[PDB]
Design an enzyme around this catalytic site. Structure first.
Site, PDB file in Angstrom:
ATOM      1  N   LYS A  13      12.814   7.520 -12.146  1.00  0.00           N
ATOM      2  CA  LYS A  13      11.909   7.458 -10.977  1.00  0.00           C
ATOM      3  C   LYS A  13      12.056   6.120 -10.307  1.00  0.00           C
ATOM      4  CE  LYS A  13       7.075   7.431  -9.483  1.00  0.00           C
ATOM      5  NZ  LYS A  13       5.664   7.291  -9.953  1.00  0.00           N
ATOM      6  N   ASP A  68       0.878  -1.171   0.000  1.00  0.00           N
ATOM      7  CA  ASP A  68       0.000   0.000   0.000  1.00  0.00           C
ATOM      8  C   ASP A  68       0.904   1.206   0.000  1.00  0.00           C
ATOM      9  OD1 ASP A  68      -2.742   0.881   0.046  1.00  0.00           O
ATOM     10  OD2 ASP A  68      -2.321   1.896   1.874  1.00  0.00           O
TER      11      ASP A  68
END
Length: 207
Positions: free
Chosen positions: A187, A79
């Site tokens: 990234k 999460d």
């Protein structure tokens, strides 16, 4: 330090609590070395869990538990979200649905800019978080936890169109640009998810 059950000592099939092909391919490739055969929960007919947690860790554990329970397989889940210091960690676990019903990435980032419009320039610290968990079975009392984070500063305007979510307003001082201005490789090399995966490799390899 983690105990037995996370790596085969043949291969152990492990369910990843997502239907995302890319994330499955991403982890499957990374864990195949350790003899782990990573499969998407959707491939196995698992429907998404209700995400009831108030922390990233609680959500990750619930998602893993549900996948494990429905499949009888060990499970990995994560999460993730954006936590802004001045807002007490918000959007936090509300990151994906920040702007309420009918949320989209753009409306979410615009709502964050509005919420932050009067926060002084030097108080706009934030971190992206990815919490990854690995449960041996639905009742495992001691899942492995791998928490990656990535600090930055919220901009006042969006810059860049790469990535997703709040990336266009997440400035990364070390790179002098936002997360949306970075390429995927760039990234992926420094992000919260990259850091969490690296951790997941270290825990399994070490003790």
């Amino acid at each position: 330090s983690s105990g037995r059950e996370n790596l085969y000592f043949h291969m152990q099939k492990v369910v990843l609590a997502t239907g995302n092909v890319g994330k499955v391919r991403e982890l499957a490739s990374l864990l195949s070395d350790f003899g782990l055969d990573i499969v998407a929960q959707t491939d196995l007919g698992v429907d998404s869990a209700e995400e009831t947690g108030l922390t990233f860790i609680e959500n990750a554990i619930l998602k893993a538990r549900h996948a494990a329970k429905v499949t009888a397989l060990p499970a990995i889940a994560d999460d993730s979200g954006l936590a802004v210091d001045v807002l007490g960690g918000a959007p936090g676990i509300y990151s994906a649905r920040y702007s309420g019903e009918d949320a989209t990435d753009q409306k979410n980032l615009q709502k964050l800019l509005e919420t932050m419009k009067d926060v002084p320039d030097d108080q706009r610290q934030a971190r992206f978080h990815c919490v990854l968990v690995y449960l041996r079975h639905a009742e495992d009392p001691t899942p492995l936890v791998c928490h990656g984070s990535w600090p930055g500063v919220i901009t006042r305007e969006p810059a860049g169109t790469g990535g997703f979510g709040y990336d266009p307003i997440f400035f990364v001082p070390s790179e002098g640009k936002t997360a949306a201005e970075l390429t995927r490789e760039e990234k992926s090399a420094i992000s919260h998810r990259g850091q969490a995966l690296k951790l997941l490799l270290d825990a399994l390899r070490n003790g």
